Design a protein around this ligand. Structure first.
Ligand SMILES: CN(C)S(=O)(=O)c1cccnc1
Ligand SMILES: [Zn+2]
Length: 140
């Protein structure tokens, strides 16, 4: 589990969004596994605006943050998980590392701020849903 709190926005994995999230919906995209809902209190996170390919991610199934190199966001085939069938996911970055389903929502961060959240795992990789293209998160 986990979310990004930027401005008056909450960014979660679409597959983990709550009824309150859907009732306060700003934007969602199944192909990206992302949903954004509105918040009453302002958040503590800053979104990265960059093309970094190195950063650090939180792995809840290890209680650890790991430094990783990761691919640029792309359209990637993802094998079946407990929460999605085998499918193509867009805006997905991959790194070598540990990811189980409950790790979804862990933050990946670079020197510029939050890059994205854990969205995929298995076969010794961790996949992250990028948010650095979502410039509207920074205003309004
Ligand atoms: C490069 N990829 C194909 S992607 O999925 O990250 C992407 C990026 C921008 C717009 N639409 C899709
Ligand atoms: Zn960066």
């Amino acid at each position: 589990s986990g979310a990004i709190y930027v401005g008056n926005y909450r960014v979660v994995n679409r597959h983990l969004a709550t009824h309150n999230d859907w009732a306060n919906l700003v934007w969602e995209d199944s192909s990206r596994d992302l949903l954004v809902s509105s918040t009453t209190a302002q958040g503590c996170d800053t979104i990265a605006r960059c093309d970094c390919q190195t950063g650090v991610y939180y792995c809840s199934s290890r209680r650890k943050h790991y430094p990783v190199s990761f691919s640029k966001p792309s359209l990637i085939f993802v094998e079946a998980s407990e929460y999605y069938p085998a499918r193509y996911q867009s805006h997905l970055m991959l790194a070598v590392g540990h990811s189980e389903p409950g790790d979804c929502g862990g933050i990946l961060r670079c020197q510029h701020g939050v890059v994205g959240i854990v969205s995929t795992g298995g076969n010794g990789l961790v996949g992250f849903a990028d948010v650095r293209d979502l410039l509207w998160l920074d205003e309004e």
